[PDB]
Structure 1
Amino acid sequence: IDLSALNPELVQAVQHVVIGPSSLIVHFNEVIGRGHFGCVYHGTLLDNDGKKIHCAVKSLNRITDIGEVSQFLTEGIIMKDFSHPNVLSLLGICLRSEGSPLVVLPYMKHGDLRNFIRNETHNPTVKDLIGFGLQVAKGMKYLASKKFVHRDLAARNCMLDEKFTVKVADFGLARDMYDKEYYSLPVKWMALESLQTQKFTTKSDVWSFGVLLWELMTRGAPPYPDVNTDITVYLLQGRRLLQPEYCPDPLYEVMLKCWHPKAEMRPSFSELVSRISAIFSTFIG
């Protein structure tokens, strides 16, 4: 890539988080995932004392289009100041003389939250699953305070580390693989007004958060499984996702608030953290 062709403010932001190529070993044989535009590898990052850091290394598959390269770098820069225990952080960006720039992320042992809760070899309790939802709300409360709108909040895009801490993220692996849940947009997670206008706000992130809570309470069931990505007509008939069998009544009430037909009337993520903290606290385990 020719750095001189990129936006100079973007390049300057990249240089503030640059990783020198000799500090990063990309394990090209160890693929975490691959889609149409991107690929993710395991990597080893060496810090100044020689400590080895297990990381995920994201690359583009092609670097010929300046728009794609700029957008890819911009995605990394957007997260460089995210500093919160429930938001994925950026280790840095490795610029190489040949090939794609590399976006370097701390490695998340348990992958994405959706596949984690779907894995029958794990046995999270109802309280544990509510806790995951509380952690997402805390990360979203932080992001909303920065006026950041996520636009694709869903269990598939959040990560889980080795301590089972949820990191809100925009993994986008299913998106980049053209997963069925994206239609032309993640319509089964979208607020009614975004289905109609394709505009997104923090209050439409709240709608998506309600769907994510439903994902947690069903251990990763697909929402509206007998509805094709028809969802706008379906909702306007007067419908919502049904209450999962093990979803507490107050948490379903929270879901229905998240899906209020008026975006202005949906609870803030600050309110959601408070309410879900209380519900979580009623469980012994």
Structure 2
Amino acid sequence: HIDLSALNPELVQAVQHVVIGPSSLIVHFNEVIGRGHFGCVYHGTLLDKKIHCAVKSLNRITDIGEVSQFLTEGIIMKDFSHPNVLSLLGICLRSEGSPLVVLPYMKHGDLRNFIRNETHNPTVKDLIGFGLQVAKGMKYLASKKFVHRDLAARNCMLDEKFTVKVADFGLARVMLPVKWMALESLQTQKFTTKSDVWSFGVLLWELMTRGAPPYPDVNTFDITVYLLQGRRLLQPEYCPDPLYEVMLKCWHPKAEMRPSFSELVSRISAIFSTFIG
């Protein structure tokens, strides 16, 4: 509720709670590790102990009202941190004309690119483990009243230790590609944790196919009509039977009947547990 778009004492104090000192951050301007509609994100060094980080500059501190709600929520609610959620490390106010927003560094980038890379060899166990990590991150987001709205493998990041973090690029909200949306979202534009559970099922399917495009047999214009006839994504070749049953539960047409993220954590933890060695 505090104003993040105009200078006021509440905004200044909230940002100070997450300040990174002027001698604590170094931006490696020649190492662009993120590019998109938002511009560039640079690799950096955070002095706490030397740690890798990712830095996005702003034109001024009042531009913080325009960044992801994962970052904005942490500053406002003071309690937002989970190993499987990509959130704020801090903000460096060293230059008034260039405040620096800093997040953790994820070496392997976006999960979809990682699993599509022909040089990488993640096993089925690794892929299912990435799915379990996403469900734990989402279970935490759901507990915080967050609705992701764009859950897909391209929005999940993978770090050097193989920790997956659910990332947000401006669409999450405290409470789109059509082939990831729940039926009731395609029909009524309503988004809840249950519509994220539907996107999660699609995410699992992306992991089991190593990033294949969903519904190769269905045009974008016909996806809703296809789902209305009870049709769903087919079981990928290396997907265990109980994992596909979990996927089908995620795509139940009645939102109330889909499992919660806590139950997904439990079911996927039991399947992942069978991958020994």
TM-score (norm 1): 0.83
Once the two structures are overlaid, the 10-residue window that deviates more, 201-210 or 237-246, is 237-246
Aligned 8 A contact 2:152 2:180 in 1: yes
Distance 1:10 1:22, change over 3 A: same
Task: Tell me: CA distance 1:71–1:262, structure 2 relative to 1, closer, same or farther (3 Å).
Answer: closer
Give the drift of 1:26: 1.4
Tell me if structure 2 keeps the 8 A contact 1:191–1:207: yes
Cα distance change of structure 1 residues 8 and 189 upon mapping to structure 2, 3 Å threshold: farther
Cα distance between partner residues in 2 of 1:65 and 1:83: 22
Structure 1 stretch displaced more, 252-261 or 217-226:
217-226
Question: Which stretch shifts more, 215-224 or 3-12?
Answer: 3-12
Deviations 1:250-281 (A, max 9, x none): 11111010011011110011111111111112
Asked if 1:14 is matched to 2:15, the reply is: yes
Distance 1:218 1:257, change over 3 A: same
Indicate if the aligned counterparts of 2:5 and 2:63 stay in contact, CA closer than 8 A. Answer: no
- Preserved contact between residue 67 and residue 170 of structure 2 (Cα < 8 Å): no
- The number of aligned residues is 275
CA distance in 2, matches of 1:259, 1:212: 12
The answer on whether the counterparts of 2:93 and 2:99 sit within 8 Å (CA) in structure 1 is: yes
Distance 1:157 1:72, change over 3 A: closer
Q: 1:100 to 1:71 in 2, by over 3 A?
A: farther
Q: In the alignment, is the contact (CA less than 8 A) between 1:158 and 1:168 conserved in 2?
A: yes
Shift of 1:75: 6.4
Deviation at 1:45, TM superposition (A): 1.6
Identity among equivalent pairs (%): 99
User: Residues 133 and 164 of structure 2 are in contact (CA less than 8 Å); yes or no, is this contact kept in structure 1?
Assistant: yes
> By how many angstroms is 1:138 displaced?
1.3
User: 1:80, 1:90 within 8 Å by CA — same for their partners in 2?
Assistant: no
Q: Deviations over 1:71-101 (max 9, x none)?
A: 7963663796332222224210123544353
| TM-score, normalised relative to structure 2 | 0.85
Question: 1:250 and 1:258 mapped to 2: Cα distance?
Answer: 13
8 Å contact from structure 2 (residues 68, 168) kept in 1: no
Report the 3-state secondary structure (helix = DSSP H, G, I; strand = E; otherwise coil) of the residue aligned with 1:276.
Answer: helix
Structure 1 pair 152–21 and aligned structure 2 pair: CA distance change class (3 A) = farther
Correspondence for 1:118 among 93, 116, 119: 116
Give how far 1:215 is off: 0.6
In structure 2, the gaps of 5 or more residues are none
Shift of 1:14: 1.8
Task: Tell me the alpha carbon deviations over residues 182-227 of structure 1, each in whole angstroms, 9 at most, x when there is no partner.
Answer: xxx1322111111122221111110011011001100111212454
99-108 or 191-200, which moves further after superposition? Answer: 99-108
How far apart are residue 70 of structure 1 and its match? 9.6
User: In terms of mean alpha carbon deviation, does 248-257 or 137-146 score higher?
Assistant: 137-146
Decide whether the 8 Å contact of 1:35 with 1:173 is kept in 2. no
Q: Could you say if the C-alpha distance between residues 256 and 43 of structure 1 is closer, same or farther in structure 2, counting changes exceeding 3 Å?
A: same
**1:80/1:136 CA distance change after superposition, 3 Å:** farther
Once the 2 structures are TM-superposed, how far is the Cα of residue 117 of structure 1 from its aligned partner? 1.0
Segments of 5+ residues of structure 1 without an aligned counterpart are: 178-184
